[PDB]
Scaffold this active site. Structure first.
Site, PDB file in Angstrom:
ATOM      1  N   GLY A 121      -2.232   3.465   1.110  1.00 28.12           N
ATOM      2  CA  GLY A 121      -2.397   4.957   0.472  1.00 28.12           C
ATOM      3  C   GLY A 121      -2.636   4.777  -0.577  1.00 28.12           C
ATOM      4  O   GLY A 121      -3.342   3.767  -2.306  1.00 28.12           O
ATOM      5  N   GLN A 142      -3.645   7.396  -9.653  1.00 32.53           N
ATOM      6  CA  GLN A 142      -4.021   6.399 -10.147  1.00 32.53           C
ATOM      7  C   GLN A 142      -5.159   6.591  -9.724  1.00 32.53           C
ATOM      8  O   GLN A 142      -5.849   5.196 -10.545  1.00 32.53           O
ATOM      9  CB  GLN A 142      -3.532   6.513  -8.561  1.00 32.53           C
ATOM     10  CG  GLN A 142      -2.752   5.177  -8.701  1.00 32.53           C
ATOM     11  CD  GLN A 142      -1.985   4.635  -6.649  1.00 32.53           C
ATOM     12  OE1 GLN A 142      -2.318   5.589  -6.663  1.00 32.53           O
ATOM     13  NE2 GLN A 142      -1.482   3.591  -7.009  1.00 32.53           N
ATOM     14  N   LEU A 170      -1.502  -0.924  -6.646  1.00 33.00           N
ATOM     15  CA  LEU A 170      -2.881  -1.327  -6.906  1.00 33.00           C
ATOM     16  C   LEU A 170      -3.098  -0.922  -8.375  1.00 33.00           C
ATOM     17  O   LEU A 170      -3.652  -1.912  -8.968  1.00 33.00           O
ATOM     18  CB  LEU A 170      -3.669  -0.236  -6.270  1.00 33.00           C
ATOM     19  CG  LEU A 170      -4.096  -0.057  -4.858  1.00 33.00           C
ATOM     20  CD1 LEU A 170      -4.230   1.107  -4.433  1.00 33.00           C
ATOM     21  CD2 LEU A 170      -4.213  -1.425  -3.963  1.00 33.00           C
ATOM     22  N   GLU A 173       4.139   6.558  -2.825  1.00 32.60           N
ATOM     23  CA  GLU A 173       2.762   8.158  -2.933  1.00 32.60           C
ATOM     24  C   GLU A 173       3.791   8.926  -4.092  1.00 32.60           C
ATOM     25  O   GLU A 173       3.663   9.071  -4.831  1.00 32.60           O
ATOM     26  CB  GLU A 173       1.621   8.085  -2.122  1.00 32.60           C
ATOM     27  CG  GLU A 173       1.480   6.944  -1.101  1.00 32.60           C
ATOM     28  CD  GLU A 173       0.476   6.006  -2.565  1.00 32.60           C
ATOM     29  OE1 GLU A 173      -0.365   5.424  -1.485  1.00 32.60           O
ATOM     30  OE2 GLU A 173       0.099   6.362  -3.658  1.00 32.60           O
TER      31      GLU A 173
HETATM   32  C1  BB2 Z   1       5.602   1.350   0.331  1.00 36.90           C
HETATM   33  C2  BB2 Z   1       3.610   1.643   0.141  1.00 36.90           C
HETATM   34  C3  BB2 Z   1       3.152   0.222   1.082  1.00 36.90           C
HETATM   35  C4  BB2 Z   1       2.111  -0.124  -0.648  1.00 36.90           C
HETATM   36  C5  BB2 Z   1       1.147   0.950  -0.937  1.00 36.90           C
HETATM   37  C6  BB2 Z   1       0.225   0.676  -1.504  1.00 36.90           C
HETATM   38  C7  BB2 Z   1      -0.580   1.384  -2.218  1.00 36.90           C
HETATM   39  C8  BB2 Z   1      -0.303   2.055  -3.560  1.00 36.90           C
HETATM   40  O1  BB2 Z   1      -0.279   1.369  -4.363  1.00 36.90           O
HETATM   41  N1  BB2 Z   1       0.583   3.257  -4.092  1.00 36.90           N
HETATM   42  O2  BB2 Z   1       0.518   3.586  -4.824  1.00 36.90           O
HETATM   43  C9  BB2 Z   1      -0.702  -0.801  -1.431  1.00 36.90           C
HETATM   44  O3  BB2 Z   1      -1.752  -0.223  -0.254  1.00 36.90           O
HETATM   45  N2  BB2 Z   1      -0.024  -2.260  -1.056  1.00 36.90           N
HETATM   46  C10 BB2 Z   1      -0.742  -3.075  -1.170  1.00 36.90           C
HETATM   47  C11 BB2 Z   1       1.085  -3.290  -0.070  1.00 36.90           C
HETATM   48  O4  BB2 Z   1       1.971  -4.234  -0.939  1.00 36.90           O
HETATM   49  N3  BB2 Z   1       1.275  -4.046   1.197  1.00 36.90           N
HETATM   50  C12 BB2 Z   1       0.430  -3.534   2.035  1.00 36.90           C
HETATM   51  C13 BB2 Z   1       1.725  -4.404   3.765  1.00 36.90           C
HETATM   52  C14 BB2 Z   1       2.540  -4.169   3.001  1.00 36.90           C
HETATM   53  C15 BB2 Z   1       2.411  -4.199   1.515  1.00 36.90           C
HETATM   54  C16 BB2 Z   1       2.761  -5.884   1.495  1.00 36.90           C
HETATM   55  O5  BB2 Z   1       3.706  -6.641   2.242  1.00 36.90           O
HETATM   56  C17 BB2 Z   1      -0.655  -4.096  -2.715  1.00 36.90           C
HETATM   57  C18 BB2 Z   1      -1.368  -5.691  -1.513  1.00 36.90           C
HETATM   58  C19 BB2 Z   1      -2.358  -3.874  -1.986  1.00 36.90           C
HETATM   59 ZN    ZN Z   2       1.244   2.788  -6.735  1.00 35.56          ZN
END
Ligand code: BB2
Ligand code: ZN
Ligand code: BB2
Ligand code: ZN
Lengths: 171, 171
Positions: free
Chosen positions: A48, A53, A102, A144
């Site tokens: 997302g 951002q 991110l 988000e």
């Molecule tokens: C509830 C929202 C889940 C995460 C959203 C974020 C996107 C973001 O930073 N939004 O502000 C993302 O892609 N995050 C990834 C992340 O943390 N993830 C992706 C899969 C689930 C989780 C890791 O367990 C990172 C690795 C880039």
């Molecule tokens: Zn974020």
């Protein structure tokens, strides 16, 4: 095209993004933003993204995962545009989860959020929804929607002990 | 020689380091540790270091900043070994400061700590002190002593808003 992502520390990330008008959604400039946001999110491999951002203080969210690499244990989220979202918790129950922003690269933190919420938004077409979301999506959505209020998951860490770098959390 | 520094996330950083015996301070192995700690700290350009930061759970601290050609705005910190330190706040007054931990690379955070403390320690020679410290030193000392109780500055952030990456805070 791909835009630069603001890192935690830049104050833009703490200011409140404002509403999108029923007009802006038709501006050629708008359509380009969306494109950028997506192309940007896709690049960093995110699930997302929020306008701020990348530097725009407008209530604009973009979600959707292309069923791909990394996360062979993370369900999918359909592509979609979220505008002027408004959330309301429906229960006091919580679901833990290790979030990563991110804007906060290489680090994940344990965050408990409600798992049943009533969200109301609007899409690129102008259709206004009002459904009740649950599970992972709600998590994403809430994460988000937070940026729009100038809030980073780091602000909600349950315990600062449960927060660290990926490189070393995987051990 | 230089040793590796544990990054935030590794649990070693959260466990309580234990006391140093009146004997250990003579072990040839000990003397080597110190040397290492210093040579290590000097490398990363730090003002202090705690045994755990390199993997040893022993109440051992190393401080020291000579020709402040690195960091200006601050006092000097004389080279010194701190063992089995015990602090006690003397006032409720606070002095703000942007701390950065070696274990939390590329990031600073605003932290308010007491500015008048009574510390009691012991040096490589076995001499036991008990003086009252204030100003920048107290800050350092407290910061370092924290790592022995398994605590990182991040645990004391005044406001999470005031915390971010160097790259972008220098704006
Ligand atoms: C509830 C929202 C889940 C995460 C959203 C974020 C996107 C973001 O930073 N939004 O502000 C993302 O892609 N995050 C990834 C992340 O943390 N993830 C992706 C899969 C689930 C989780 C890791 O367990 C990172 C690795 C880039
Ligand atoms: Zn974020
Ligand atoms: C309470 C201040 C003492 C800081 C001690 C740390 C060393 C450490 O993390 N020990 O556990 C350090 O060198 N920190 C540096 C730091 O934060 N400094 C060095 C000078 C003053 C202050 C920020 O300007 C970083 C940037 C390398
Ligand atoms: Zn430290």
């Amino acid at each position: 095209s791909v835009r630069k992502i603001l890192r935690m520390g830049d104050p833009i990330l703490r200011k409140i993004s404002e509403p999108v008008t029923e007009d802006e959604i038709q501006t050629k400039e708008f359509k380009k933003l969306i494109r950028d946001m997506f192309t940007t999110m896709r690049h960093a491999e995110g699930v997302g993204l929020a306008a701020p951002q990348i530097g725009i203080l407008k209530q604009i969210v973009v979600v959707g995962s292309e069923d791909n690499e990394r996360y062979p244990g993370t369900p999918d989220v359909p592509e979609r545009i979220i505008l002027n979202p408004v959330i309301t918790p429906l229960t006091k129950d919580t679901s833990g989860f290790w979030e990563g922003c991110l804007s906060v690269p290489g680090m994940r933190g344990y965050v408990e959020r409600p798992n049943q919420i009533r969200m109301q938004w609007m899409d690129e077409k102008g259709n206004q929804f009002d459904e009740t979301i649950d599970g992972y999506k709600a998590i994403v959505y809430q994460h988000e929607c937070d940026h729009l209020q100038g809030i980073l998951y780091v602000d909600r860490l349950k315990d600062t002990k449960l927060f660290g770098f990926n490189e070393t959390l995987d051990s």
